[PDB]
């Protein structure tokens, strides 16, 4: 110790500036802290978690406070399709006068920012109606944040910190989390939907003052007890419904309609109440599986042992995986990220097709800013899952306790996994690019029919299995004979089939040859991205070039020039190269979503369906064409609202281009440059009176990679995020 950092003595005595940089990056790595013990390791994590909940609640109290102090929330409700939602107010004392005018919009009095996070619609749907609901909404969350900060402190004192056995109780935790956390919360959210939300959308204002008088259903709390639940779906909202008033307002609370609300282009309220009620039950019943204290229920250790296939094809099967998971934090985190990485992509995919908030399918910019947002989050999280897979194989894996089980075998044929991933990537790469250049050339010479247009028929067959009639394949749910059709003709099909054939929504868009070629480009990304990460994980423990890689840790610079040079060998670097392919891959996904929708919203769907088969079509008709309004944010003639997005656009290009400087130019050059400089400063008069306390040295090899990637990612997000918002909001269509 003896100075910053307090948690690492080896860094403390480092005299150079390396200590300061490395005292920040290794703050949260609790294992490598000096004098750590397994009780501290958990107790810090538990306290740290409460710190992360404090931020989340404080963060959400910010949004409610500004939207209700500087926002259009009461006015926006009065006409959702013609009043720009307002995020907050602008007070920047560098603004000149024509900017102050330009950024005054949305019916405010000074400059403001238009909110594209779509909070305004979400709070409309879930029943909020004035400013005052929001203020108490702010206070409450602010209080919840205060409560969490107490807890993070409380569980560090003696007589309030859990022991080891408390955290390692994997059974009693899975009951509560499955039954209490996932379970009851979904049941209670159903309660709010049918006590406030649904009554709000029928003109009834129900609040904590009076929510005891009002009845969710005029015969409420009976029909459920008797067993004839067949009354809560009796008389739903009429087709001609106005979302905020009583016209056509039915009285059903739980339904199964499945279509869209005709006016607001969203899912029906009464479906969403039912669904959270349905999956409120599944988790409750799924919550009583494992044994805690009462002598019934499975033992997760036993289930793993029992599933050992006879014949030996899976060796000793899942034997011993209980302890290996239940003792390796980096294992548990890996699984959490993998599951969280998927559903976030799932959230992105479902929200834009089935708009769950009122008046959010016609705010085009909000759609794009949301779907693009969640995919990039999902791209990052999924990379972490493999990254903490590698740390598992290094720090916590044990090659004895996992003898021949399913886990050790994945280290036994690592050659077979790696090569085939290489094959599938190569096959997709050659031909997806191959057919593309061919399509490009054939159009360069003035012959568009000589392209290779492969009809994506399997996805068109599936769309025909869900009821889309454009392709006329006449299969299940698209053919009248099918029992599957008959099994649903009176429950949800009339609404679901009416939504799927409507040509305004994004539910099952028509796909053509363009969508075939892009999907493989997407598919190419996933394999190649996986290949780097999977190659990193399985070779973390060792390989032929260095069969004792485990003795150095997850992240080390290199192993020297010998044996032919070993640059970029740490499993860290495998994560490093991976991010580049993630950003490229997610680049190819969000690109595709934006252009397909931006042609749709204009009703010009032919433009995508032809230009999207040759690369110059993507460069001319999407990038070059749609950026005409963005780059004019400010010119020698004047400025516009779009100036801020024009500025950020270049700011994105600048950070990105600084990224190259750290990736290409490596350390040894700069270190020789500092030494001359640290000589000049030591001989200049009037400036040899000031002496560095910490000697100046160039960044370390790994730090430059991390720093270089930080710029590349930041510049790559800001650049696209500016173009995505400005181009769409410029036309608002």
């Amino acid at each position: 110790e003896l100075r910053f950092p307090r948690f690492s003595q080896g860094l403390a005595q480092d005299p150079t500036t390396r200590r300061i940089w490395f005292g920040i990056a290794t703050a949260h790595d609790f294992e490598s802290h000096d004098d750590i013990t397994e009780e501290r390791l958990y107790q810090n994590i538990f306290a740290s978690h409460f710190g992360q909940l404090a931020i989340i609640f404080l963060w959400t109290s910010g949004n409610l406070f500004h939207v209700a102090w500087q926002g259009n929330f009461e006015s926006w409700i009065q006409d959702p399709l013609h009043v720009r939602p307002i995020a907050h107010a602008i007070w920047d004392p560098h603004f000149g006068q024509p900017a102050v005018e330009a950024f005054t919009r949305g019916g405010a009095a000074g400059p403001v920012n238009i909110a594209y996070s779509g909070v305004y619609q979400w709070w409309y749907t879930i029943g909020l109606r004035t400013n005052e609901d929001l203020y108490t909404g702010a206070l409450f969350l602010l209080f919840l944040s205060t409560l969490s900060l107490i807890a993070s402190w409380l569980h560090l004192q003696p007589k309030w910190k859990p022991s080891l056995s408390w955290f390692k109780n994997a059974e009693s935790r899975l009951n509560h989390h499955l039954s209490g956390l996932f379970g009851v919360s979904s049941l209670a959210w159903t309660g709010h939907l049918v006590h406030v939300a649904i009554p709000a959308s029928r003109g009834e204002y129900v609040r904590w003052n009076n929510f005891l008088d009002v009845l969710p259903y005029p015969q409420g709390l009976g029909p459920l007890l008797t067993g004839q639940w067949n009354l809560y779906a009796q008389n739903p909202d009429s087709s001609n419904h106005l979302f905020g008033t009583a016209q056509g307002a039915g009285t059903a609370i739980l339904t199964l309609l499945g279509g869209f609300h005709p006016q607001t282009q969203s899912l029906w309220l009464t479906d969403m109440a039912h669904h959270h009620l349905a999956i409120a039950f599944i988790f409750l019943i799924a919550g009583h599986m494992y044994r805690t204290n009462f002598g019934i229920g499975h033992s997760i250790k036993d289930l793993l042992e029992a599933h050992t296939p006879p014949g030996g094809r899976l060796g000793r099967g899942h034997k011993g995986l209980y302890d290996t998971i239940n003792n390796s934090i980096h294992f548990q985190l890996g699984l959490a990220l993998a599951s969280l990485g998927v559903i976030t992509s799932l959230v992105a995919q479902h929200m834009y097709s089935l708009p769950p908030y009122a008046f959010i399918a016609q705010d085009f910019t909000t759609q794009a800013a949301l779907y693009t947002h969640h995919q990039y989050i999902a791209g990052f999280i999924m990379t972490g899952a493999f990254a903490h897979g590698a740390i598992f194989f290094i720090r916590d894996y044990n090659p004895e306790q996992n003898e021949d089980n399913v886990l050790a075998r994945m280290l036994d044929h690592k050659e077979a996994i790696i090569s085939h991933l290489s094959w599938a990537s190569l096959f997709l790469g050659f031909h997806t690019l191959g057919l593309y250049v061919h399509n490009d050339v054939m159009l360069a010479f003035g012959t568009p029919e000589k392209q290779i247009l492969i009809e994506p028929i399997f996805a068109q067959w599936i769309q025909s299995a869900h009821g889309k009639t454009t392709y006329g394949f006449d299969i299940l749910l698209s053919s009248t004979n099918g029992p599957a059709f008959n099994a649903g003709r009176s429950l949800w099909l009339p609404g679901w089939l009416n939504a799927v054939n409507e040509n305004s929504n994004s539910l099952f868009l028509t796909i053509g040859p363009g969508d075939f070629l892009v999907h493989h480009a997407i598919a190419l990304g996933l394999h190649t991205t996986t290949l780097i990460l999977v190659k990193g994980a399985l070779d973390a423990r060792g390989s032929k070039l260095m069969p004792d890689k485990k003795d150095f840790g997850y992240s080390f610079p290199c192993d020297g020039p010998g044996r032919g040079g070993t640059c970029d060998i740490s499993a860290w670097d495998a994560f490093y190269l991976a991010v580049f392919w993630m950003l490229n891959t997610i680049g190819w996904v969000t690109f595709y979503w934006h252009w397909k929708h931006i042609t749709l919203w204009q009703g010009n769907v032919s433009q995508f369906n032809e230009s999207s088969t040759y690369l110059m079509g993507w460069l001319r008709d999407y990038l070059w064409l749609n950026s005409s309004q963005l780059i004019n944010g400010y010119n020698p003639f004047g400025m516009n609202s779009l100036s801020v997005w024009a500025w950020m656009f270049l700011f994105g290009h600048l950070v990105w281009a600084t990224g190259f400087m750290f990736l290409i130019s490596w350390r040894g050059y700069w270190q020789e440059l500092i030494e001359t400089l640290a000589w000049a400063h030591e001989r200049t008069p009037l400036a040899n009176l000031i002496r560095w306390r910490d000697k100046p040295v160039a960044l370390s090899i790994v730090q430059a990679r991390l720093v270089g990637l930080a710029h590349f990612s930041v510049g790559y997000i800001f650049t696209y995020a500016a173009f995505l918002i400005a181009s769409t909001s410029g036309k608002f269509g």
């Binding site: 003896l2 100075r3 910053f4 300061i20 005292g23 107010a89 007070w91 920047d92 004392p93 306390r693 910490d694």
Partner: peptide, 30 residues
């Protein structure tokens, strides 16, 4: 009104005190 006070405080003062506070803590020695 209120922004004209809170914007400078979080933009100018609160950074300055923060940077000067850390600088002493980082550069301590015991």
């Amino acid at each position: 009104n209120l922004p004209s006070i809170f914007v400078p405080l979080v933009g100018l003062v609160f950074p300055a005190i923060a940077m000067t506070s850390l600088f002493l803590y980082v550069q301590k020695k015991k």
